[PDB]
Each structure stands twice: as structure tokens, then as C-alpha cells.
Write an enzyme that holds these catalytic residues in place. Structure first.
Site, PDB file in Angstrom:
ATOM      1  N   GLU A 171       6.886  -7.590  -2.387  1.00  0.00           N
ATOM      2  CA  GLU A 171       5.623  -7.737  -1.640  1.00  0.00           C
ATOM      3  C   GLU A 171       4.499  -7.098  -2.437  1.00  0.00           C
ATOM      4  OE1 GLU A 171       4.976  -9.369   0.718  1.00  0.00           O
ATOM      5  OE2 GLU A 171       6.461  -9.263   2.362  1.00  0.00           O
ATOM      6  N   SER A 231       7.436 -13.926   4.220  1.00  0.00           N
ATOM      7  CA  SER A 231       8.129 -12.795   4.848  1.00  0.00           C
ATOM      8  C   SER A 231       9.397 -13.244   5.552  1.00  0.00           C
ATOM      9  CB  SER A 231       7.231 -12.036   5.811  1.00  0.00           C
ATOM     10  OG  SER A 231       6.257 -11.301   5.112  1.00  0.00           O
TER      11      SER A 231
END
Length: 267
Positions: A140, A42
Site C-alpha cells: 500500500e 484492498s
């Protein structure tokens, strides 16, 4: 001795560590496996927000994005509460950084647009900042889960540290856009156990974490000394030998940061 201290720490945690602190006017670069690739996880969400800020006037932050339950396919602490309301581009930037919200990131990638759901546009943005190393190929949550051999979805401590330098301490963004990114990173909720835990309380820390398979734990930060001298700190780690489900070790990043803080401090 400091590369020896990092190598000892990594051995003790049964991990691979990478560290980069860019040079300043008064300090040498700190580099340990700094040109080795590590998964972003991330950590890419900080430069993604910069890409969206860069491309758009700030009125764009008030644009409402609607989505559905089918768009929630990764950990999304904020976006899973707003399926019926939607979220503004600003709210999505906030969530992507402060809660590492995966749906928010995927919606911001789509906002950049183009092939691969925006991943090419993101990578192009890093190329525009002179980063020829980093690449994002997946959204993601797949970008957290590549095997260690895969260059897809990777950066280096060196590359990401210089990107963050440019964004927060350099001229990549005009001041109003820079201030938004800085504030979101400053109020991140996910980083208390990583670089923040390795710096004395009188240092300000702004950061973006990343976590993934194969024991991956990352943190990218900008820190301010008690006298307002800034430094960029990138710490990346993985545990390729522990399997895809190896435990990430947040405290390794805290300990590496403690060693960095020791070298940067000037009483």
C-alpha cells in the site's frame, strides 16, 4: 440474457465489469469477464488476514506491533491513531478488513515476512489454495495505482471468488480462524453502497471492498439467503478509458449485485 444485462450495465456506466459467483449444488456459476484480470486494490486484505491466521496459532493475535509515522503512507483510519501505542496483530487484522487500513495491511505483510515486504509470502499463500492467477507485487498504496496493462497486483473475479469460497465456506481454515475472518468481513464499515446495496435486507452480506486509480471499484462478498444458503459474489470494475483519475462507480457494483440476487433468489 444475463451476460447481455451485465454488458448493458457496464456500457451505461462507461466501465468494464467482471462478475463471478461460483456454482453450488442448486445453482450454475455466474460468469462475466470472470477470467479477465482486474487490480485487487484492498480486496487482497481479506486473504492476507487468512494468510496470517493460517501461518500462526491464535495466541499470535495478542502480539504487539510497534511502528512510526513513517509507516503511514496509505489511508489508515485506525493505525494513524496508534503510532505511540502500537497495535496487536488481531487489531491490525480488524483494521485491515473493517477500515481497509493500508498501514495495517503493510504490517501484516511484514508479519508474513520474506522478499518484497511480505508480498511474495502473500502470493505463495494464494498458490497454496490452488490460485495460480493472482499476484501481489507492491505494498500500500502503490498496489492501487498500477496502469491497466500491468499484471502486477491483479486477480480475476474467478480466482478471488474461489479463494474466498475456500476461506469462508471451505476447509482452508479451521473453524476458529474461519470465524475471525467471517466476523471481520461481516462488520466491514466500507461496503454499504456495493454488494450489500444490491441484496435484499433479509440476506446477510460479509464483504471486503477495494478502490483505486483508473476508476477501480471492487467488492468480494459471501452472502447468506434468508434460509441460510451461502454464495460467494465477486464484482470488479474499472474505467481504463477515463484516465488514472476516472471516478470509481460504487453503484455499478450494487446494480450488478441486484442482477445476481435476482438469479439466486428462490421464494
Amino acid at each position: 440474457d444475463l451476460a447481455d444485462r451485465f454488458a448493458e450495465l457496464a456500457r451505461r456506466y462507461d466501465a468494464r465489469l467482471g462478475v463471478y459467483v461460483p456454482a453450488t449444488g442448486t445453482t450454475a456459476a455466474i460468469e462475466y469477464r470472470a477470467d479477465e484480470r482486474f487490480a485487487f486494490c484492498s480486496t487482497f486484505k481479506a486473504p492476507l488476514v487468512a494468510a496470517v491466521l493460517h501461518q500462526n496459532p491464535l495466541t499470535h493475535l495478542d502480539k504487539l506491533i510497534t511502528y512510526t509515522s513513517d509507516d503511514i503512507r496509505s489511508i489508515s483510519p485506525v493505525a494513524q491513531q496508534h503510532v505511540q501505542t502500537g497495535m496487536t496483530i488481531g487489531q491490525l487484522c480488524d483494521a485491515a478488513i473493517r477500515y481497509s487500513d493500508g498501514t495495517a495491511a503493510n504490517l501484516l505483510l511484514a508479519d508474513l515476512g520474506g522478499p518484497g515486504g511480505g508480498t511474495a509470502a502473500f502470493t505463495g499463500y494464494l498458490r497454496s489454495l490452488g490460485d495460480t492467477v493472482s499476484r501481489l507485487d507492491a505494498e500500500e498504496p502503490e498496489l492501487n495505482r498500477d496502469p491497466p496493462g500491468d499484471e502486477r497486483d491483479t486477480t480475476t473475479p474467478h480466482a478471488i471468488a474461489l479463494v474466498l469460497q475456500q476461506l469462508v465456506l471451505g476447509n482452508a481454515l479451521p473453524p476458529d480462524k474461519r470465524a475471525l475472518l467471517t466476523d471481520w468481513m461481516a462488520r466491514n464499515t466500507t461496503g454499504a453502497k456495493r454488494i450489500r446495496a444490491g441484496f435484499p435486507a433479509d440476506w446477510k452480506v460479509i464483504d471486503k471492498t477495494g478502490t483505486g486509480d483508473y476508476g477501480r471499484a471492487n467488492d468480494i462478498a459471501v452472502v447468506w439467503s434468508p434460509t441460510g444458503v451461502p454464495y460467494v459474489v465477486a464484482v470488479m470494475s474499472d474505467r481504463a478509458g477515463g484516465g488514472y483519475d476516472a471516478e470509481p462507480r460504487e453503484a455499478l457494483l450494487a446494480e450488478a449485485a441486484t442482477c445476481v440476487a435476482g438469479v439466486l433468489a428462490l421464494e
